[PDB]
Design a protein around this ligand. Structure first.
Ligand SMILES: O=C(O)c1ccc(O)cc1C(=O)O
Length: 438
């Protein structure tokens, strides 16, 4: 396959559904490269667990943890890492209120080259145990010979775009990683980087981040087709922010408008949102505790009941993962019969203004609160006009894209409700015999 899109291993499915899945121990194994140094960008860390996922022979190599924690949370993380002399920390600045450092990325420096991993899992045992999570694995990027002058750039501009994402942190430990990237040849990269960083962006900088970045890429590198109004938009996520009092405030006015962009020329496009119902969570492998990782609060949800009419159940028979609750986030543009897709994005970004950005100042400024990162698969980057959807995720032309959940998505039934993490569920017990009492 040219796509290098993987799911994490799930404990408890049949082996056919983990063949070709990856555990973090697989990603860090010597088979992938002889580790010299690594950076772990993430939100939540269990440092004792994390160090045990590195091969024993690599556990004293330098590790940088890039995080957004402040105050006592920051102290707790520093205390976690203090027993390991080889671990350094970088606190990502979060100068806009209510922002978070959501990006999940590994930079892996080897004796043989460099690898970039952009994924959706926190660095804790539960996120790699029984959840549906996504991974993009870069090629092994070779080092550019000293004295040779070449860009090392790909047709998707991935090298410059990753460096630009890292520059936005303004962090000395990440300048070191920028210099590493400069020294390597990333020209084989076939995906586009889509990042979010905190700030208020106007003018040309508007197109650099969030949903304006997506719009720019779809305008420049995708083509509109006849009856494009009939190609749905699908969004799939583990968390929902406050979107406003109705769909015109943000969801269908600027977010959907960016998502439905195709090509450079001048809406009834169906929008499917996939988010676990209470019943999805209750009957999951984890049971109700899976809902601790689906943080939709009742305070938010009661202000936007209009949104839930867009919601579709989690279903993933194609990958044997209907009972492995999603922490992956994906967005895509399928054809009216869901047999093709015009593009596919895997990202850390949930359905929220903080992650994707919201226009301010009479439409002239895009304000983003958080750090996010994903990669975009465009057919043009593979010499194609569209991607065929793979019918079975782990089945046997390699130019069909592995969509990890079922199409078409299934609308909530009348008795279904979106999972809301901070109210009780005491009507029916979960797969472990328990209720949910927050
Ligand atoms: O796992 C995360 O990085 C995360 C952190 C805080 C949230 O409120 C939501 C999420 C999520 O991605 O679901």
């Amino acid at each position: 396959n040219p796509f290098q899109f993987y799911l994490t291993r799930v404990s408890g499915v049949k082996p056919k559904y983990n063949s070709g899945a990856l555990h973090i121990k697989d990603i860090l194994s010597p088979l992938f490269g002889t580790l010299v140094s690594s950076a772990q960008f993430n939100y939540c860390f269990d440092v004792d667990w994390l160090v045990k996922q590195y091969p024993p022979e690599f556990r004293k190599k330098p590790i940088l943890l890039v995080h957004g924690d402040k105050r006592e949370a920051k102290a707790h993380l520093h205390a976690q890492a203090k027993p390991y002399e080889n671990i350094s920390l970088c606190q990502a600045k979060l100068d806009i209120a209510f922002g978070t450092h959501h990006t999940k990325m590994m930079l892996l420096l080897y004796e043989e080259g460099l690898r970039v991993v952009i994924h959706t899992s926190n660095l804790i045992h539960a996120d790699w145990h029984q959840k549906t999570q996504g991974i993009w694995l870069s090629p092994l990027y070779p080092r550019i010979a000293d004295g040779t002058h070449k860009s090392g750039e790909s047709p998707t501009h991935f090298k410059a775009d990753l460096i630009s994402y890292l520059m936005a942190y303004n962090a000395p430990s990440l300048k070191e990683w920028i210099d590493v990237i400069h020294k390597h040849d990333l020209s084989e990269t076939n995906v586009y980087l889509i990042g979010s960083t905190p700030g208020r962006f106007q003018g040309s900088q508007k197109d650099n981040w969030g949903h304006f970045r997506l719009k720019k890429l779809l305008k420049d590198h995708a083509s509109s087709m006849p009856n494009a109004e009939s190609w749905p938009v699908v969004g799939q996520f583990s968390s929902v922010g406050s979107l406003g009092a109705d769909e015109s405030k943000w969801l269908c006015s600027e977010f959907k408008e960016s998502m439905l962009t195709l090509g450079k020329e001048s809406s009834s496009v169906p929008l499917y949102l996939i988010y676990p119902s209470v019943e999805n969570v209750r009957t999951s492998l984890e049971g109700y505790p899976a809902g601790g990782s689906l943080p939709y609060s009742i305070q938010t949800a009661e202000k936007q009941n209009w949104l839930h009419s867009y919601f579709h159940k989690w279903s993933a028979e194609t990958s044997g993962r209907s009972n492995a609750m999603p922490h992956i986030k994906t967005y895509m543009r399928p054809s009216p019969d869901f047999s093709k897709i015009a593009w596919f994005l895997v990202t850390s970004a949930n359905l929220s203004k903080a992650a994707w950005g919201a226009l301010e100042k009479n439409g002239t400024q895009l304000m983003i609160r958080s750090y996010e990162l994903g990669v975009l698969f465009l057919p043009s980057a593979f010499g194609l006009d569209s991607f065929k959807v793979k019918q079975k995720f782990f089945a046997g032309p390699m130019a069909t894209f592995p969509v990890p959940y079922d199409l078409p998505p299934e609308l909530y039934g009348s008795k279904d409700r979106p999972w809301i993490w901070n109210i009780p569920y005491v009507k029916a017990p979960d797969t472990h015999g328990n209720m949910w009492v927050p």
